[PDB]
């Protein structure tokens, strides 16, 4: 058969294994100068050559250790497993791929520690009063979600430097608000006050002893406090096996990196812990503010979830920051911090409702494609995250690892870890390129022309100059030829104008900035189409002029991504069910729908138009769609409840759907989707 294995290779086991994953090799001495050594296994097996000598490595994945997912959480922290399997070994032949599956569970009763980092500007004096008994209120609302809760407290104002602070009169250094006829603490950068403890009564005691301070400029040094809280693991008291919440309450803009030039501070902020025995930020006055990139690195490294409990006037500013800091949630805070307790509980529920995988230390020779099963059993392709989960739900992701050629490292390992999870999957990849026949290698064998070339794997790999099957034809001694197969067909150029027609075989040229290979020196690895100045878009390897796109990418130019994470819309459906996903971008096939995720449409059917069947699917369970799984797969609303007919606060879709019974089903749609379906419609 004219397969790729027989056309290329046919020189050594080492070269043919790299031709393609399906190629094999026969080292048996049978078939003298007959069928090619390299071909599909059945082709080689069919033509004899099967003395169990075929070298056909197969990529395999083995689970070195996989403890079952713990179902209860709490109990013994060391035994709480949220990712299964925990370690897997991959053996990939050259340019081969192997698929492997993992499971992630949001275990119930998982320990959580909440660290409260409150801005203490003078405008936060009202806020500090309502927090007075937040420790006990927070404990009562969390004991129904977690057995192990620990809460800490920290405060920040700004850098105690010449600007941002009042340095005159001398009394202002001790009572900054003295010009307003009031008493306040001297300004501080960051002040850790209460380490994470289970005794919630300690939180109430510490907040009652706190006080506010007054600075000059509106922006606060909040990001300085966030960095110290994240990196001071020992001081703060984070637990490795627990959900790390960092509630960041503020009501003003925040200083960013390079703002320290105003104070004369030019040293970049290194992500180090500078909180001393006095629990104060030592480097507050000598180190610049952290950048957004640095904070994300440390937040991701420490597995800390950041909550922006900000007020209305800066909700958009921190929402836009949250875009540049993945893994953060923004909650609107009252001007007196009267709803912080509900803000934290909602934030925690939102954090535990999503699972997103991240890859760390991925070798450049490997690529990964992730498929998400999420809730129900729909395998959304090219998605590494599942949203809408509740505590106890398990999601499975199928990942395929493809290697770019044959790396020489032979031992690499990367970690696949969900965001915010201590647990992770350690993947050990061991590349397998050379064959077992190479062990029995003869550097100078009498078979290969009285040992002028090396013999191994049943063929002769001749040295320089000497060529041929047995290294007996030399290089220039056979310039004339009579059985030469240099030309692929009669009348065609000899060796495709890229080689020398000596001793029948076509010896390819030096192959500058590339490598010319093939029976007629037609293949190469420098002729593939360059999309943006890179061959195969730098997302693929050139194989005989064809871009062999690795996993995670596809297309002739290997520029169309298989990632569909962009499509995923707040709605929970790829590109809001109003269109498909083409290379990340959404194609809004739905008429009148547009946007980045085809989520906004003002001229589509109203909620009632379809939500009527959503209630008929569950509230009635009649007509249709009840056997189509739409009531659960599609209908995330609630079943028949009541008709308050007063819930117009947000999302008030009044629907008087008419049922088959003629009753006027008055249901109201109400950003968790909730359907206030009438208990019983009136016919």
């Amino acid at each position: 058969g004219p397969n790729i294995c027989t056309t290329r290779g046919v020189s050594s086991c080492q070269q043919c294994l790299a031709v393609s994953p399906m190629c094999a090799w026969c080292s048996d001495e049978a078939l003298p100068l007959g069928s090619p050594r390299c071909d599909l296994k059945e082709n080689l097996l069919k033509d004899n050559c099967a003395p169990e000598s075929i070298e056909f490595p197969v990529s395999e994945a083995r689970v070195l250790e996989d403890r079952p997912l713990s179902d209860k959480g709490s109990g013994d922290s060391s035994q709480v497993t949220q990712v299964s399997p925990q370690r897997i070994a991959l053996r990939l032949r050259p340019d081969d791929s192997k698929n492997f599956s993992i499971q992630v569970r949001q275990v119930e009763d998982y320990p959580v520690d909440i660290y409260y980092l409150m801005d203490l500007s003078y405008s936060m004096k009202d806020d500090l009063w309502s927090i007075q008994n937040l420790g006990t209120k927070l404990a009562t609302q969390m004991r129904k979600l977690t057995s192990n809760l620990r809460i800490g407290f920290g405060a920040f104002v700004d850098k105690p430097v010449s600007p941002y602070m009042y340095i005159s009169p001398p009394e202002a250094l001790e009572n900054p608000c003295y010009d307003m006829k009031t008493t306040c603490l001297p300004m501080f950068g960051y002040k850790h006050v209460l380490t994470l403890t289970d005794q919630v009564t300690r939180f109430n005691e510490e907040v009652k002893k706190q006080s506010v301070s007054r600075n000059r400029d509106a922006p606060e040094g909040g990001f300085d406090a966030i960095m110290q809280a994240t990196v001071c693991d020992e001081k703060i008291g984070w637990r490795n096996d627990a959900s790390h919440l960092l509630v960041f309450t503020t009501d003003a803009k925040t200083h960013i990196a390079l703002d320290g030039r105003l104070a004369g501070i030019v040293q970049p902020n290194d992500g180090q812990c500078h909180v001393g025995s006095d629990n104060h930020y030592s480097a507050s006055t000598t180190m610049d503010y952290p950048s957004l990139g640095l904070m994300t690195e440390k937040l991701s490294q420490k597995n800390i979830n950041l909550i922006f409990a900000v007020t209305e006037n800066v909700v958009n500013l921190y929402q836009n920051y949250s875009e540049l800091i993945p893994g953060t949630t923004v909650g609107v805070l009252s001007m007196d911090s009267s709803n912080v307790l509900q803000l934290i509980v909602d934030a925690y529920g939102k954090i535990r409702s999503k699972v997103e995988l991240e890859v760390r230390d991925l070798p450049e020779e490997l690529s990964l494609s992730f498929n998400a099963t999420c809730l129900n059993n729909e395998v959304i392709p090219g998605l590494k995250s599942c949203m809408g989960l509740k505590i106890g739900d398990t999601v499975s992701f199928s990942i395929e690892a493809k290697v770019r050629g044959c790396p020489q490292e032979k031992e690499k390992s990367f970690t696949i870890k969900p965001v915010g999870f201590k647990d992770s999957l350690i993947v050990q990849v061991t590349f397998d390129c050379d064959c077992a026949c190479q062990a029995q290698a003869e550097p100078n064998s009498h078979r290969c022309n009285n040992g002028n070339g090396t013999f191994e794997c049943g063929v002769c790999r001749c040295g320089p100059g000497w060529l041929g099957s047995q290294c007996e034809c030399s290089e220039e001694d056979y310039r004339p030829s009579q059985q030469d197969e240099c030309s692929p067909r009669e009348g065609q150029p000899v060796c495709s104008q890229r080689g020398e027609c000596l001793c029948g075989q076509c010896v390819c040229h030096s192959s500058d900035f590339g490598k010319i290979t093939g029976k007629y020196c037609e293949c190469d690895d420098f002729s593939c189409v360059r999309y943006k100045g890179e061959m195969c878009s730098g997302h693929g390897q050139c194989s005989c002029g064809d871009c062999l796109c690795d996993s995670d990418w596809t297309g002739y130019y290997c520029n169309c991504t298989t990632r569909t994470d962009t499509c995923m819309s707040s709605n929970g459906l790829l590109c809001s069910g109003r269109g498909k996903c083409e290379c990340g971008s959404c194609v809004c096939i739905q008429p009148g729908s547009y946007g980045d995720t085809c989520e906004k449409c003002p001229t589509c059917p109203d909620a009632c138009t379809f939500k009527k069947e959503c209630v008929e699917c569950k509230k009635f369970d009649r007509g249709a769609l009840h056997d189509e799984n739409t009531c659960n797969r599609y209908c995330r609303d609630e079943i028949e409840s009541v008709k308050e007919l007063k819930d117009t606060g947000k999302d008030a879709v009044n629907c008087t759907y008419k049922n088959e019974d003629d009753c006027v089903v008055r249901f109201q749609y109400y950003g968790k989707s909730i359907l206030y379906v009438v208990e019983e419609p009136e016919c």
């Binding site: 405008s123 007054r214 000059r216 400029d217």
Partner: peptide, 4 residues
């Protein structure tokens, strides 16, 4: 008018 302006500041903290």
């Amino acid at each position: 008018g302006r500041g903290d």
